[PDB]
Symmetry: D2
Subunit: 392 residues, 4 copies
């Protein structure tokens, strides 16, 4: 197939730009020029590009340089038609953030971190970004007695309340998306799952401005069901953005191409995002790829891997639609009573009083006869997979 701008495929500058310096070895690729990145991505079908302040402008660039870089970057966008849907801030690389940005034990670091973000907000607003992604990669601990979690949540909240305040006052219209991750680089990161992140956001001052940006690999690092977590995020209406990639369970963060890790779950995820109610997608934001071209690859492998992300999503989309359109699947869905879950448990107007009065719901209920009937889930699963294999 072919990607259109309506597919809304976006990529971070740090994805195709990863030089491949891992925890155990040196970089295997030279630095990627941002203008070239813009050009290369425009060519493969991306509709937008994202970045961390520091991916674009080298940490400690004088005003002249910074200004210089931005203007060249704006031209490239101009020329290519790519947009900047989201921007983020690097609060994890520099040694000053070793104990965190917003929740560093050191108060001076917290103040500095806020300033660094305000500044990226400005650039973001100027480039037309709608979302500010916040990844607290250094928020956490290696040792339990080293971090007061309650105080850290207070400080995290305190910093976000301020960012919302500023954005609203400057009229930036940004939405904020917290990105949860269980560990790496800290032994344990605060807001470890999509769940914890949603619960937190609900405690902010203007909760309507905050949501989450879950990443496939992060939930899988804890062996959780990504599709199921996204289904909950959508239920809450907190899916502000999504990062797609691949992972092979609980181990270091792999950042593989989307669909190169848990293929079955990548299939069900695409199905959930696209085969939304009223035919339409359940999610309309950017389909952002936060992945890394393997260290064994050169620049050709890099563009090949960028294209693979798009091809995987579109191939899966195609099979998810065929799946839902199959009359035999329709028959299996019915036998499994998937849609019966959408009908309220109670009849309209019934409350506990009427439920208590219904002998058929308890006193005369034959639990044994109901318990003997199967749901036909295995057959339904087998049909889904045969659709994925293109065998039907």
């Amino acid at each position: 197939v072919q990607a259109t701008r309506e597919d809304k495929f976006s990529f971070g500058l740090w994805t195709v730009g990863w030089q491949a310096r891992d925890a155990f070895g040196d970089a295997t690729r030279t630095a990627l020029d941002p203008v070239e990145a813009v050009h290369k991505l425009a060519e493969i079908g991306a509709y937008g590009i994202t970045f961390h302040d520091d991916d674009l402008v080298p940490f400690g660039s004088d005003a002249q340089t910074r200004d210089g870089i931005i203007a060249g970057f704006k031209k490239a966008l101009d020329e290519t038609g790519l947009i900047v849907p989201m921007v983020t801030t690097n609060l994890f690389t520099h040694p000053v953030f070793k104990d965190g940005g917003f929740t560093s034990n050191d108060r001076s670091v917290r103040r500095y971190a806020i300033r660094k973000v305000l500044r990226q907000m400005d650039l973001g607003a100027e480039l037309g970004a709608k979302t500010l992604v916040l990844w607290g990669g250094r928020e956490g601990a290696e040792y339990d007695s080293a971090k007061d979690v309650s105080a850290a949540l207070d400080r995290y909240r305190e910093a976000l309340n301020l960012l919302a305040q500023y954005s609203e006052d400057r009229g930036y219209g940004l939405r904020f998306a917290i990105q949860p991750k269980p560990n790496e680089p800290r032994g344990d990161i605060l807001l470890p799952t999509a769940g914890h992140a949603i619960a937190f956001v609900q405690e902010l001052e203007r909760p309507e401005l905050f949501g989450i940006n879950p990443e496939t690999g992060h939930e899988q690092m804890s062996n959780l069901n990504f599709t199921q977590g996204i289904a909950q995020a959508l239920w809450h209406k907190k899916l502000f953005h999504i990062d797609l990639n691949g992972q092979h369970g609980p181990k270091f963060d792999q950042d593989l191409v989307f669909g190169h890790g848990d293929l079955l779950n990548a299939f069900s995820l695409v199905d959930l995002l696209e085969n939304g109610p009223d035919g339409a997608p359940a999610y309309d934001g950017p389909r952002h790829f936060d992945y890394k071209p393997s260290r064994t690859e050169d620049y050709d492998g890099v563009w090949e891997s960028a294209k693979a992300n798009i091809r995987m999503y579109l191939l899966l989309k195609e099979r998810a639609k065929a799946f839902r359109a199959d009359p035999e699947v329709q028959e299996a869905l019915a036998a499994s009573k998937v849609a019966e879950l959408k009908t309220p448990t109670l009849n309209p107007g019934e409350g506990y009083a009427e439920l208590l009065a219904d002998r058929s719901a308890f006193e005369d209920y034959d639990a044994d006869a109901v318990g003997a009937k199967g749901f036909g889930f295995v057959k339904l699963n087998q049909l889904a997979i045969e659709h994925l294999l293109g065998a039907r």
Copy 2:
């Protein structure tokens, strides 16, 4: 040490009463009489006993039979002085619940599930229980297409709103605590971690009546930090109850004695609960043990294991107390800046305008000098362990 009623140690009837029939073998123990369990627990120092409806009254007992059991039960409670702080309902054993209770795809099962729970609420309220624990062990799926999560959350919420209503109307004054679990017995369980359950609870009609009942091993099954998740539950003020046990990371649910799994996390958990703010404990509900005496043991091993739970908690408590009263530990805390996280990042009355104005927060900030100072976290962790080891 010896346990006092003030310690509030409670056990489920199903813990010391587990007959040890696992997934691969027959029971190794004969059934425990509930009255006998009441007497034995009182004798080891428990202050309360809890139970699932089906633990006390065999599924399908006629009313005469059920009435008799309840009366003998109440007599034992009376005579021993034990209380019933929480009650729960078995919505997972009978074949009828193979696809869940409140969220089964089958509508009639959902109606029956609610009635089973309402009936248990009556019995709980009559025994004086203050909390109703909800463990949706069968709410979930083995295959992604078999369950509409959104519809499932709607149905879950629909059942919970009804229960709150009934309780409030009857003046039962119950609090509801959802118990999260990632998997087992379903491939994936809905509301998999404490975070997911908290975010869900926030969407109910009367959220103030709802909290969580997190279990040590359950969060460890996802390799998450239990103490850190408890800290967040406390920050939200949703820790209504707690289940203590042991686990060895991601594998089947072991239900070992508390402290027999991740000892270091058990230590930091007791520190968090007892050395709360203002000298006093941060948590005041029951310290409930939801564990299982190993299948290799006989009734002597069962009582030994019940006592081991209490000993474990008291030994860790003593060490946590000594830890904090150690001037060397205090000095390390000060050097690590733990308490400085409790100081607002912003000055009183300071807003973004003033922050933007502070050149010491950015323009004149020496990130490099700050970045080079060590936090002394290792030394702090070492003192903590020397206290646990009784080496200090």
Copy 3:
């Protein structure tokens, strides 16, 4: 695609016959009659059936009874043309085996364990079985001080040496296949991975008679690469049998249909077993399915799930073949140097003296230049996945 006797699909009596009584609920299916099982399996295309002693003859049947059952069973075999390629012994269900069979701390249980297996060997010999599978499910511990691992290995070895002696004296011609599992039902099981089992077998008196029977799901419970461990087993020539099923990482043993867990790894496994050395399979034994029909299914679900196992294998086989026959794949394989690994590092007759004399292997070697060339592994992976999805 349809199954042939040549495909060698076999199933354990205990797979389709699993009543779905799990660690948290009652059985949802009635007992399956063995003669019935033989007939149904013959019908779906199985070439053979396997069983534990206790699956066929209920624990403690008198000889008359036992004798009667065997006679009926052999008749069913006869009529359908099904063989018994492997047999095993239940050394895990009965309470006497709570601390192990061959490695129980209790000497009398160890003696009894051996007698139970000798007895099963005679029956297997009688039915024409070629392999004796040994799954030491109760060998291991919950606590480190409870089991002397060294002594346990001595006793595991003592028992196996005896079994081989007996088989060899009697002329049974059996091969012995140890089945590794990391945990469940015990906290930790002895010989936890394919590797631990192979290393152990190398220490027996007649090692040539011993190999392993690895199970997809068991290696995945530790997050290991199943295909890669099978490759090592084949390298050692110790792959005597294989148990296929599905699993979703580290959690309780799921026993899903083959290919319903890690699909990518199911694909690479079929490629490995089938696209062997010549053109011929690299493995010639039974393709045994050790799975469980989900607890939510009735007998229609049971037969559907049996067929799904065969269907997944044949579908993956078909795509593995197509993958290897593709010119574009051939090209990608050439660019990634997969086949260059098969060429010795040393030239014929070269030793350390000649290597040391080669300035080009070190002194004049341009490591920087070589390190800059890409392997094109992502592209190769992408072609494989597209073959799997029937996209090419």
Copy 4:
């Protein structure tokens, strides 16, 4: 507690020398001078130091430089009395090794990796090292079709056979220790566990010169029981060296101080190594710490962490000793029949025929009666933890 040279504590130069550049941030510490490291370690009680060729001599130093560095290093060992018990080679950092050393698909890289190692062998022999540790960090893959495992094992073997030939011919008297790791940095590494490494070594030309160097965190990354795995290595007599550190289950490689991860397992481990047969340790080699001072620390934190390792080991030893010496433990050990596993299952000269004629081993055996006696394992376990806690 004080460390003596008889304790044999060793540290890798790359441990205290780790500059704390992780996968997400820059170094937080400056480089450590080898000579200084030597003086500092001597000072905290270590008996020896180890290093990777590239840790001591910067990759690509001329012989003049190389020679100079070796001379100074040699002086420091001289003055301090420290020895070099083991050396290793860096076959993972440089980009050329992106697909492995010995198993790179590129033939030239394979020739080069061997040369790199022969050279390091020379230096090792000159400094008196007795063990060559091989950590195949880059041997493996991210994608199944990219690496022919069988060909890889052949090439791994070919390289090792040459190394042993050379050492034996030059009369170096080295022992080779393969260090297993499941993943990181490759998606999956060849020889993922202690078990796989042991099986592989058994296939070499001179297997008696080869063993393993297992690391605590490596086995825990797969959630395996490190103590039980060491016990197996000991049973095989392949424990040639051991790397101690801490880890919190399946996640990135943490490399915490020994005992700061799974503390209960750290305890059973010291017990296994020290309370060997007849008072004497079961293991005699170096107790090497392969850990990293947390990224949040400065040089102060670095030395602290170095001493914490020694401290942890000595405190555990002390408690393991006391545990075993306790008559109450001695009594519990007897009741649990731990030592009965040491008695052969068979009587002297007893074979299959005598066992088949023994009616007490089967026909007249009361499995139900034996199945009901408890093993008293929880109680023994509780005694161990009370000893660890200093409460006994």
